Homo-oligomer: A and B are copies of this chain.
Amino acid sequence: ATLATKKATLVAALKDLQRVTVAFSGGIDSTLVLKMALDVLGRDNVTAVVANSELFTDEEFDKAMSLAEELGANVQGTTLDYLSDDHIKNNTPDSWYYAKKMFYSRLNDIAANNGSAAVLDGMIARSLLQEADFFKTDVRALAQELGLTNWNKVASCSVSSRFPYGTTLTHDNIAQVMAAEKYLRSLGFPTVRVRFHNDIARIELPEARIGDFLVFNDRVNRQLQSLGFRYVTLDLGGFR
């Protein structure tokens, strides 16, 4: 339960696997797994996969593709068509599960195609970090120990959560929500939700940021209206 002991448990696991395919999102967790896998197995035994999809931002895709190459890995993008599944398209309350099936099936296929022994992710499918009992504390210490300083500081969540259960997702309403959230982040609010209620936009901010938001009220109102919302509102209860 020392860090040196957990790092060794991780090393021993990667060595036994020989070849791996890493589901790589660009956060600090998957960043740590990919770097360790490269160090222990070498570039030509590691394949980093970054999923491109409608449910997540193109900025997160382009950032993870760039970061994985930056760590010295063979990186491959793959495009998932989440809305082709009827459960996801109609935002069923179990649609999270159908999306994971699509995801891991694709990476399972890529991994069997390239001869990998397992698909790896960054939980703290094999979650080696979790298996070695890494906490966020340990992930921070080891990443700094390897010289890592660059990763996506905001981990994102599926845009489906912005729509009520049963609401049909469309390319247009997803783009409208993602454009609104991107604008709000560019103003200094990295944690924000633009909940979609047809003609009404309902913005969720952490309550301690709401006073800071006041200077932007008018600009946000006009911008989100130009994106197609008729009414632009701020939820009084805050984020969650």
Contacts and interface: CB of A to CB of B under 8 A. Distances in A.
Interface of A: 1-4, 66-67, 69-72, 135, 137-138, 140-141, 143-150, 187-189, 197, 200, 202-203, 206-221, 231-238
Integer count of this chain's copies in the complex:
6
A144 B149 contact: yes
A2 B140 CA distance: 23
Given A148-B147, A150-B144, A188-B206, A71 B236 contact: no
A37 B132 CA distance: 26
Nearest to A6: B70
A59 to B, nearest CB: 11
A145 B149 contact: yes
A63 to B, nearest CB: 9
Contact of A200 (B72, B197, B232): B197
Contacts of A148: 141, 144, 147
Contacts of A188: 206-208
Contacts of A213: 208
Contacts of A216: 207-208, 218
